[PDB]
Ligand binder design. Structure first.
Ligand code: NAG
Ligand code: NAG
Length: 398
């Protein structure tokens, strides 16, 4: 859409680049909200309303073609990110789901490089990514997420998309969802926005999930028809890793009786281990709390290979068919090596209560506990804070 008059004021976030010899060194980065979360309205004289809702093409009368959509739909800058539940303080990023004015911004943001015009590209095969988190105010049904998508570095800045990454354009993931704009351009044919995605962190205070998602396409692919579906170009399900699903029920939760106690803040380490030819082979997650390393659990379920790490053998044995067919752990790693954009978000799920994260086989939450109508009785103001984002050499971030 056309950038409007209103100025965009991005929150600044200090992050770190780490090596064993040099330790962790500060770097200046900026934070940008998703393009379609900025105010999107019609050009002067066309009346009130936006340019389409999630899941659909843009409206045909303001957008009959890309060129008309590019002048008839306006995307305003956000001068005060706090009005969308997004604030920073030095090395910390606070995401608030619900505000006191009653809105539910549910923010999704990306990490911009120091120029503000290009996303920070992370290349993590053979390296590790680490962060500290406070998950106390995330009850059953909430999802705080921190992940990588293979978005274009400038947000696909182009003739009809002059805003680019400065405005948060170019979102994609492995779900191939239909959005009214893709790469900042009206999505006239209602295609889906597809790309490889590494779900580093999807969690609340009750459960923690990790999952790589492969696609057989490089970068953002605009799919049509069956390309967008389950047997198409991307792996919807991913290769999931959750202590509850592998029958280790005392690892993570609210209380001293769990090895990772979500009543207190903790550190989350994720290592992308490669073979001697440079291809990703294993994904290893462990935690640090109160100055002590907390090793990963090992699997404990009949029919699941004994492992403390994500790998092809584990993914295949747990039924992750599309993950294997669309590239497997090596394919995930090839996307990581090309370069990925960091996304952070906080959201709930009116349709299914986030059951795949923390109910049944996945956690301790009861049927209905995760509904939004019930979340607000437990915690009226859900939020998450991420602090000291840092990445680099194996063994150097913690
Ligand atoms: C920013 O962080 C410092 C602690 O490092 C804290 O003392 C201060 O209250 C924080 N600022 C805001 C606006 O919360
Ligand atoms: C789950 O773990 C318990 C031990 O805590 C064990 O008795 C049970 O057999 C395990 N279940 C499966 C399906 O392996």
């Amino acid at each position: 859409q056309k950038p409007g008059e209103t100025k965009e004021v991005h929150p600044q976030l200090t992050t770190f680049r780490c090596t064993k010899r040099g330790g962790c060194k500060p770097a200046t980065n900026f934070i940008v909200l998703d393009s379609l979360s900025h105010p999107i309205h019609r050009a002067e004289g066309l009346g009130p309303g936006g340019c389409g809702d999630w899941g659909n093409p843009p409206p045909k009368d303001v957008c009959p073609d890309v060129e008309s959509c590019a002048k008839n739909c306006i995307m305003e800058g956000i001068p005060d990110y706090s009005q969308y539940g997004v604030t920073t303080n030095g090395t910390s990023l606070r995401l608030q789901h619900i505000l006191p004015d009653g809105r539910v911004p549910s923010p999704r943001v990306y990490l911009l490089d120091k120029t503000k015009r290009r996303y920070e590209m992370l290349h993590l095969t053979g390296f590790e990514f680490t962060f500290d988190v406070d998950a106390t105010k995330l009850p059953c049904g909430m999802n705080s997420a921190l992940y990588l998508s293979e978005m274009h570095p400038t947000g696909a800045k182009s003739k009809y998309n002059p805003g680019g990454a400065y405005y948060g354009t170019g979102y994609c993931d492995a779900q191939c969802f239909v959005t009214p704009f893709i790469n900042g351009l009206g999505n006239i044919e209602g295609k889906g926005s597809c790309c490889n995605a590494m779900d580093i962190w999807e969690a609340n205070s009750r459960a923690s999930h990790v999952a790589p998602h492969t696609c057989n396409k490089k970068g953002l692919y605009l799919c049509e028809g069956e390309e967008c579906a389950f047997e198409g170009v991307c792996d919807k399900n991913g290769c999931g890793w959750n202590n509850y699903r592998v029958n280790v029920t005392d690892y993570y939760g609210r209380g001293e009786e769990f090895k990772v106690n979500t009543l207190k803040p903790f550190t989350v380490v994720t290592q992308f281990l490669a073979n001697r030819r440079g291809k990703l082979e294993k994904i290893h997650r462990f935690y640090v709390q109160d100055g002590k390393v907390i090793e990963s659990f090992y699997t404990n379920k009949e029919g699941v290979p004994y492992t403390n790490m994500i790998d092809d053998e584990f993914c295949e044995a747990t039924g992750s068919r599309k993950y294997m067919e669309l590239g497997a752990t090596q394919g995930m790693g090839e996307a990581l090596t090309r370069g990925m954009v960091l996304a952070m978000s906080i959201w709930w799920d009116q349709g299914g209560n986030m059951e795949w994260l923390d109910h049944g086989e996945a956690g301790p939450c009861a049927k209905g506990e995760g509904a939004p109508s019930n979340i607000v009785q437990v915690e009226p103001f859900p939020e998450v804070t991420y602090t000291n984002l840092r990445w680099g050499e194996i063994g150097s971030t913690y």
